[PDB]
Amino acid sequence: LAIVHLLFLHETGSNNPTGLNSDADKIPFHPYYTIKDILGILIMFLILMTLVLFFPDMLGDPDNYMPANPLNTPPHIKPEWYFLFAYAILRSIPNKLGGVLALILSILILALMPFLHTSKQRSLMFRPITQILYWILVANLLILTWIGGQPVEHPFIIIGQLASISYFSIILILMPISGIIEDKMLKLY
Amino acid sequence: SVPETQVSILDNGLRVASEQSSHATCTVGVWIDAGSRYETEKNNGAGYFLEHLAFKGTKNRPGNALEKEVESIGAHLNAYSTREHTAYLIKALSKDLPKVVELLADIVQNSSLEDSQIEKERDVILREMQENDASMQNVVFDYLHATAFQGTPLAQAVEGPSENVRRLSRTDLTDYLNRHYKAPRMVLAAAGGVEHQQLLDLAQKHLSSVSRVPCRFTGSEIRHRDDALPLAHVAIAVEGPGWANPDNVTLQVANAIIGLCQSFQTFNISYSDTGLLGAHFVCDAMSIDDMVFFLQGQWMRLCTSATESEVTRGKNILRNALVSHLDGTTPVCEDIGRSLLTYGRRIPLAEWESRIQEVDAQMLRDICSKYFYDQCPAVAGYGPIEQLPDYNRIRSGMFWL
Numbered sequence: 015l016a017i018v019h020l021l022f023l024h025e026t027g028s029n030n031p032t033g034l035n036s037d038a039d040k041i042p043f044h045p046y047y048t049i050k051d052i053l054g055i056l057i058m059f060l061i062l063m064t065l066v067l068f069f070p071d072m073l074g075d076p077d078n079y080m081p082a083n084p085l086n087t088p089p090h091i092k093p094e095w096y097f098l099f100a101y102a103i104l105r106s107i108p109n110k111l112g113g114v115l116a117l118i119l120s121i122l123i124l125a126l127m128p129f130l131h132t133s134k135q136r137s138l139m140f141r142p143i144t145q146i147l148y149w150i151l152v153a154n155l156l157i158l159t160w161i162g163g164q165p166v167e168h169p170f171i172i173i174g175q176l177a178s179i180s181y182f183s184i185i186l187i188l189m190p191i192s193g194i195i196e197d198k199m200l201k202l203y
Numbered sequence: 204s205v206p207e208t209q210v211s212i213l214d215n216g217l218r219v220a221s222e223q224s225s226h227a228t229c230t231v232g233v234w235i236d237a238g239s240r241y242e243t244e245k246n247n248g249a250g251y252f253l254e255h256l257a258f259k260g261t262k263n264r265p266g267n268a269l270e271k272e273v274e275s276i277g278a279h280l281n282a283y284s285t286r287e288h289t290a291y292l293i294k295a296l297s298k299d300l301p302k303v304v305e306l307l308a309d310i311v312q313n314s315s316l317e318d319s320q321i322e323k324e325r326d327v328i329l330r331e332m333q334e335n336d337a338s339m340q341n342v343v344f345d346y347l348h349a350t351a352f353q354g355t356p357l358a359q360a361v362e363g364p365s366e367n368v369r370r371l372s373r374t375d376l377t378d379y380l381n382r383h384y385k386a387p388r389m390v391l392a393a394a395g396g397v398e399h400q401q402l403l404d405l406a407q408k409h410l411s412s413v414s415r416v417p418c419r420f421t422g423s424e425i426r427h428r429d430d431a432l433p434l435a436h437v438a439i440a441v442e443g444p445g446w447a448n449p450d451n452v453t454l455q456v457a458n459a460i461i462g463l464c465q466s467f468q469t470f471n472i473s474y475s476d477t478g479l480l481g482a483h484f485v486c487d488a489m490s491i492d493d494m495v496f497f498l499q500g501q502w503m504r505l506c507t508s509a510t511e512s513e514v515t516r517g518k519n520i521l522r523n524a525l526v527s528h529l530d531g532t533t534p535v536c537e538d539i540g541r542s543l544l545t546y547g548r549r550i551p552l553a554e555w556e557s558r559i560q561e562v563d564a565q566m567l568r569d570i571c572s573k574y575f576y577d578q579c580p581a582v583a584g585y586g587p588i589e590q591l592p593d594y595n596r597i598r599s600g601m602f603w604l
């Protein structure tokens with residue numbers, strides 16, 4: 015699937031942070047973005063090893079070092095960090111089914127993302143209001159990651175419920191309206 | 204059996220050199236060690252504009268009456284300017300040898316620069332430059348000189364920038380004329396049916412009045428992308444040795460080995476202890492990179508593996524081409540003037556043949572590895588040059604793993 019991912023991209027070429035047509039300024043990849051990928055590989059290897067050789071158990075969980083007991087259940091159970099944002103959403107929706115669906119949408123909302131682009135500019139380099147909305151989205155994604163960790167009790171629950179409401183409202187509603195407003199400010203709309 | 208070039212010297216320092224031959228017409232010229240390299244960016248078109256003004260009349264022969272004289276004997280009058288040398292030459296008959304020399308004397312001294320003419324020649328020069336851009340290979344070689352000799356007087360063109368052309372005055376010209384036209388930096392060269400003693404007496408009679416008084420190769424690239432042009436011209440060069448370094452001969456043999464793009468020409472341009480050694484090719488956009496790859500392989504090959512036979516080919520090829528004796532009078536003298544200006548002497552063809560036959564394959568690949576292998580080139584492109592590779596790919600093609 016990653017090979018198919020690379021194919022569906024070379025047909026169009028990569029994007030640039032300005033979001034403009036970069037056909038006038040393109041360079042080879044071997045000497046310019048290869049040594050850059052090698053440097054990024056070296057930095058990523060520095061962070062991994064220093065997260066294995068010095069802090070090996072930082073990201074894990076201690077209760078996984080006990081054998082699986084069906085008769086007992088770990089008192090404090092939590093998904094690993096990466097799966098938490100979803101965990102929060104699931105817990106937030108009262109209905110079980112609702113939670114499952116929202117959870118799925120949490121990931122799927124992204125797929126839905128190319129149909130929500132209502133701006134005449136591709137990138138957010140020249141779009142400050144949608145930049146603010148994007149960083150608020152990153153902020154409450156971090157909040158949902160924290161909540162998942164917190165146990166079920168006040169006021170963690172309410173934050174979870176709001177944070178999920180704010181997440182879906184920023185992705186679904188606030189960004190296209192903001193893009194319309196930004197197009198209106200540049201005398202385009 | 205080729206006749207020797209005999210050189211004498213006047214008090215002025217004007218070396219009068221001549222090489223007699225049976226041909227009854229002669230090419231008498233004056234070479235001057237003065238070009239765009241001696242200009243200091245405030246008079247960047249002084250030599251070119253003086254080269255335009257030099258045939259428009261003198262003090263003794265005012266205006267077109269002067270050129271009426273060179274029509275009267277049916278002689279031909281030519282002049283050219285490079286980055287280091289300026290030449291004023293006349294092709295005439297043998298029996299018209301005195302007056303021609305006298306004519307050349309006026310052209311170098313006693314010349315008259317008319318203010319009226321200055322405006323007319325400014326419009327000529329300006330317009331030509333305004334249309335000179337048309338000649339691509341000239342644009343590409345000027346770009347190669349600029350990007351290879353950045354910050355030096357060897358980057359600036361012979362014609363100069365339109366700016367200076369417009370902003371030039373008689374006095375400035377007078378200066379360039381009075382500064383870079385010294386007698387010790389001048390050679391009176393004659394080739395063909397001339398006697399050396401008669402030419403020496405004529406130089407003593409006229410022209411005896413002429414007054415007696417580094418560069419850094421920036422390996423880099425200039426690309427003028429203009430996609431509307433049908434063809435692309437690309438020149439790639441490295442630093443040359445200079446005039447006085449004998450391995451030039453060996454490098455010439457290397458060029459004779461090279462001799463995919465519609466047009467592929469190799470050059471060894473030499474200036475005073477510097478130069479540009481490389482290749483210029485003119486191609487369609489969709490071929491450019493392949494050409495470059497091809498070309499770099501050849502060079503690398505010579506530096507890496509070169510046989511004995513091909514060397515022989517180059518030796519022989521160069522020999523015939525180097526052959527210039529009785530090629531033409533104009534060429535013959537041109538060689539006398541350049542030899543007295545650059546080497547200080549006329550190198551005979553027997554010495555050239557000895558330096559050619561001492562070249563073998565081992566010293567050719569040694570000298571080619573000295574000058575081509577792992578060197579930073581200067582690249583100049585003009586036209587649809589998007590597929591022309593950037594500097595890392597060319598620099599990596601300058602060596603083999």
Ligand code: HEM
Pocket residue numbers: 016019020023027028029030124
């Ligand atoms: C681990 C799985 C994935 C791999 C290995 C992968 C790999 C790649 C690679 C190698 C590129 C080439 C450009 C670049 O790396 O910057 C790329 C481009 C891209 N990927 Fe992914 N990708 C993955 C998952 C995703 C996901 C989940 C998304 C959507 C959220 C995504 C969206 C994109 C987009 C939009 C581009 C084009 C960006 C650009 O080149 O301007 N990819 N991917």
